[PDB]
Amino acid sequence: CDFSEEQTAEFKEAFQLFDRTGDGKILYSQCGDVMRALGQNPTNAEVMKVLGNPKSDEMNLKTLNFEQFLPMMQTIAKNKDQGCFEDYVEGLRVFDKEGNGTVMGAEIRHVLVTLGEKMTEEEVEQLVAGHEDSNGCINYEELVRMVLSG
């Protein structure tokens, strides 16, 4: 195992802190949220490798103990690295129509909801701090530079 004793202890603390429905075992879907709370950015396909319940899983019957959780955390951690802010803002430079280093708030918030995985306006609005006031053209530098702290 690549994780330290301190990291394992912290993960075990987190595992039992982000509880509970009633039982001390974490839910199958909620496990992914724990991994994301631990700052990881895997796709839902990483969970689909284990493939607990092929159908819609409201029931979450595939509950996990710590010994089942930790390997998933490891395969997530060893999955991939993540690119620098330039790789992000290149996307914005492609989406932009002004050619000035900013982007229209109304357009970008919609684009980031429609393309790829789906998100709510409640989720997306919380990501921006330089809000769409009198000026429509939000500087996307603030967005990326803030969120990448996580």
Binding site: G105, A106, E132, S134, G136
Partner: protein, 48 residues
């Protein structure tokens, strides 16, 4: 049977974010004459 005696124009106003913030309802001159000079099997304004 539901024939409008009048012409109308609605408009809805938006903010910079793209959400509704106001509206207006314009209405033009109407065929007011018929209301007391009714032709066969025709009706007055429904309210009556």
């Amino acid at each position: 049977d539901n024939s409008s005696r009048f012409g109308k124009f609605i408009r809805i106003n938006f903010d910079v974010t793209g959400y509704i913030v106001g509206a207006n309802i314009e209405t033009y001159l109407l065929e007011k004459s018929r209301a007391i000079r009714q032709a066969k099997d025709e009706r007055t304004f429904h309210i009556f």
